[PDB]
Paper text:
The human AAA-ATPase Bcs1L translocates the fully assembled Rieske iron-sulfur protein (ISP) precursor across the mitochondrial inner membrane, enabling respiratory Complex III assembly. Here, we captured Bcs1L conformations by cryo-EM during active ATP hydrolysis in the presence or absence of ISP substrate. In contrast to the threading mechanism widely employed by AAA proteins in substrate translocation, subunits of Bcs1L alternate uniformly between ATP and ADP conformations without detectable intermediates that have different, co-existing nucleotide states, indicating that the subunits act in concert.
Previously, we reported the structure of mBcs1L in the absence of nucleotide and substrate (Apo mBcs1L) determined by cryo-EM with imposed C7 symmetry. When we imposed no symmetry (C1) in reprocessing this data set, the resulting EM map at 4.4 Å resolution showed significant asymmetrical arrangement of mBcs1L subunits in the AAA ATPase domain with appearance of large crevices between some subunits. Inspections of the model built into the map confirmed that the separations between neighboring subunits in the AAA domains are not uniform. In particular, the separation between subunits A and G is clearly wider than others. This asymmetry is also reflected in the rms deviation of 1.222 Å for 2,259 residues when the C1 model is superposed to the C7 model, which is rather large compared to those identically calculated with the ATP- and ADP-bound structures of 0.285 Å and 0.248 Å, respectively. Furthermore, the structure of Apo mBcs1L, when reconstructed without imposed symmetry, displays asymmetric arrangement of subunits, suggesting a potential mechanism for substrate ISP precursor release. Bcs1 subunits in apo state show significant asymmetric arrangement with large gaps between some subunits and are more prone to dissociate, which implies a mechanism for ISP precursor release, where Bcs1 subunits open up laterally in apo state to let ISP precursor diffuse out.
Numbering used by the authors:
A (entry chain E): 30 to 290, 306 to 418
B (entry chain F): 213 to 290, 306 to 354
C (entry chain F): 30 to 142
D (entry chain D): 72 to 142
Write the structure that this text describes.
């Protein structure tokens, strides 16, 4: 009896003073992350099991992906200057009610008093698990007085894909970030946390595409609405503006038609000035021209600064030529831009994009056909 | 990747005009089967659907689903519209791999504006 | 006590250094695939069980297809230059909640690295 | 601060538009621990019973005990 007591005391002292361990249950999502990380780190895992991800895509598409996990039992891993025991015990006693699997857990067992190794391993596992996912932008529509997830998540459009001016987009992005990351400044002074922006310009400037691109770069959601339609009313507009989801930039178009004339001109600004709002209420208004509008709309508590999108410039033309054609003579791009400017002065980016579509993978032909465009 | 790098919508359109009885629809189904892609047929010559309905259904088309339309002559000659269909086709709202095919008897009633980038890319005639 | 400790250390060293294994649970869809593949590869499977696929097609059509699976227990297969042990253990402890079947798994056990 | 034996639990939230927000938290590992508080040394026993599972939650029965000398 004395030997057993001495052994128990020695073991408990050893564990409490010289030994470190970490446990992850099967219910926790970190279980799969740690299993995948340990599989990736150790290439020569002789004992292992397999799991397949099977997806039945439409029209009878079988998509099966094979993945490998360490087999249940004991493993030894050499990490840092330490040898760590990994115990994957699948308990043969009971089954999880939520999932329908026998109780499982994993344990990392190491010698020393340096818990930072476990923290670093866990952070690396989190990073590896997160790096596979690709960010997506979800489109939202408005029906009646309700926002709906319309369509499917959209791939985020890169910022450099859309070019507007030398630094206008940079200024807009900087102002948006400054407004977003400083809510304390607004709440301390007791001012509503809302912002409005106005983009008036010739059609074909890709204003909506630029809005989607900046929403993707900011990772914020976008909710488009066509106020020029008579289906919605002033009160419906007020409700949908107020019921907009979190971090959801709301985009509106064609202010000229409604402001000229359900249809209203001061009702929209009254609804915009309403106290009922949401966290980070950003509204963008895209239109062809500003002539039909009034300075009252461009005011604090409303559209803050006005930005105008222009036609293609020499810098814009050479930047879009470089973006389309991956690596050529810069002098060729300069000559292309000069010829385009000589031929036309009100050239829009949409026309240039269509022209480049007409001459896909044909740089020299497009250069020689500028006079054809005239 | 080539399309997304240049910032161009990932959509394509094809036109097959020819005499009736050439099996254009059968060939469309056969190529859809070989590509294993799904097919969604629509008769735009009917007046049941409108321009806005056409825009919604074009935009809400499922993934890898080639959309087939027939009888452009009747609608373009005249719910019924001739430029509304091309406006809906040019709409930004689309899906991943949005391929549209248009089968018809003849091209006389149509216009060169329909055969353009961002629209039907190359014209093929069945003999 | 020393003999038990020595045997345990020898066994764990043997498994960790010289022995390879793979496990497939019954929940995973690869279970049926591997069972069918092992049935097809080995024609002379003396111990086996049967499963029928019964379909009631319209107008009273009975379509029954018979398939054969290795019986639960131990089997030996000669593949490549290796003799592999196959253990189909149907655990008589608990029943799967999702499906309504007792817990099952299959194991492939082979010598080498 | 120096809890050598510990386990980890993450709070994972799927915010709209595919926002992954994962927060890591650390709990003492099941077993025996000793804490020095006030003028006392208190034993903490976190026993996770391997007999039955809670019906309401779906977790094995667990409890924690603080054990101290004095009145």
């Amino acid at each position: 009896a004395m030997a057993r007591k001495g052994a128990q005391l020695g073991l408990v002292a050893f564990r409490r003073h010289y030994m470190i361990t970490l446990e992850v249950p099967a219910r926790d999502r970190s279980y799969a992350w740690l299993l995948s990380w340990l599989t990736r780190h150790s290439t020569r895992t002789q004992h292992l099991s397999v799991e397949t991800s099977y997806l039945q895509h439409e029209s009878g598409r079988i998509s099966t992906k094979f993945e490998f996990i360490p087999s249940p039992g004991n493993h030894f891993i050499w990490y840092q200057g330490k040898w760590i025991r990994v115990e994957r015990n699948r308990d043969m006693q009971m089954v999880d009610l939520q999932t329908g699997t026998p109780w499982e857990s994993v344990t990392f067992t190491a010698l020393g008093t340096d818990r930072k190794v476990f923290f670093n391993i866990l952070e690396e596992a989190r990073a590896l698990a997160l790096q596979q996912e690709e960010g997506k932008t979800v489109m939202y529509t408005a029906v009646g007085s309700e926002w709906r997830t319309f369509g499917y998540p959209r791939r985020r459009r890169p910022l450099d894909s859309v070019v507007l001016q030398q630094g206008l987009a940079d200024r807009i992005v900087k102002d948006i970030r400054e407004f977003i990351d400083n809510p304390k400044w607004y709440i301390d002074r007791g001012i509503p946390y809302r912002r409005g922006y106005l983009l008036y310009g010739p059609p074909g400037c890709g204003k909506s595409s630029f809005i989607t691109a900046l929403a993707g770069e900011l990772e914020h959601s976008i909710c488009l609405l066509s106020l020029t339609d008579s289906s919605l009313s002033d009160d419906r507009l007020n409700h949908l503006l107020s019921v907009a989801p979190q971090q959801s930039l709301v985009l509106l178009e064609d202010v000229d038609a409604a402001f000229l004339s359900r249809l209203t001109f001061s009702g929209l600004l009254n609804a915009l000035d309403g106290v009922a709002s949401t966290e980070a209420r950003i509204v963008f208004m895209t239109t062809n021209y500003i002539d039909r509008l009034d300075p009252a709309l461009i005011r604090p508590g409303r559209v803050d600064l006005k930005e105008y999108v222009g036609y293609c410039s020499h810098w814009q033309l050479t930047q879009m030529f470089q973006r389309f054609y991956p690596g050529q003579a810069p002098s060729l791009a300069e000559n292309f831009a000069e010829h385009v400017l000589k031929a036309t002065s009100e050239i829009s980016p949409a026309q240039v994009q269509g022209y480049f579509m007409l001459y896909k993978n044909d740089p020299m032909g497009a250069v020689h056909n500028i006079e054809s465009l005239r």
